[PDB]
């Protein structure tokens, strides 16, 4: 099953590998280090999980992070650090291996990323670019996450495809992960009782 957790520098080689498999926009390792060492609380990864059961070293494979754990998706996030707006973030890259798509991974990563940007960095909004013809990505951002289209960027990508620049305004309370536990009585942990009641 898939585990969602915060990224560390130990994940960037495999994050680059995932990017390299899933997207035409690629970056040198230096650029991932710049992200993970500037905004060490903002990026998240999705990995397989091999839990011990009641009933080796690592595979020599570019997705593997540890024995029984390989990287299947990531979200690489930064704060905007150009020249004097209020604080805002950028989703530099999001991808998930194809054999693992369509089960909520991107959504989960994204919600952790938006909440972190708000919580850790007081980000007022977040921006990103996406190919106009990317149905899956548009559905995620526009429908699932309620991003807005901010503009059309003509010939934005290298092969010449136009992008949408998209934006979402961030507010702490509505981004709390507990708001999204039920797809559809919404019981919650009050963090008080004894759970074995």
């Amino acid at each position: 099953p898939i585990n969602i957790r915060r990224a560390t520098i130990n994940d960037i080689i495999c994050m680059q590998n995932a990017n390299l498999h899933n997207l035409p926009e690629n970056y040198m390792m230096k650029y991932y280090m710049y992200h993970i060492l500037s905004w060490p609380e903002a990026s998240f990864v999705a990995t397989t999980t091999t839990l011990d059961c009641e009933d080796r070293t690592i595979k020599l494979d570019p997705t593997y992070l540890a024995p029984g754990e390989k990287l299947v998706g990531y979200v690489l996030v930064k704060m905007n650090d150009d020249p004097n707006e209020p604080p805002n973030g950028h989703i530099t890259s999001l991808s998930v291996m194809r054999t693992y798509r369509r089960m909520g991974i991107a959504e989960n990563l994204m919600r952790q990323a938006l909440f972190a940007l708000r919580e850790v960095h007081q980000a007022e909004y977040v921006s990103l670019h996406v190919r106009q013809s990317n149905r899956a990505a548009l559905h995620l951002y526009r429908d699932t996450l309620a991003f807005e289209v901010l503009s059309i960027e003509k010939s934005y990508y290298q092969d010449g495809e136009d992008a949408y620049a998209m934006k979402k305004v961030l507010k702490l309370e509505e981004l709390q992960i507990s708001n999204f536990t039920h797809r559809r009585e919404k019981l919650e942990d009050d963090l008080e009782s004894d759970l074995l009641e």
Binding site: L23, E25, H129, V130, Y156, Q158
Partner: peptide, 6 residues
Amino acid sequence: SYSMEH
């Protein structure tokens, strides 16, 4: 996806 080219 950010394109570092432009």
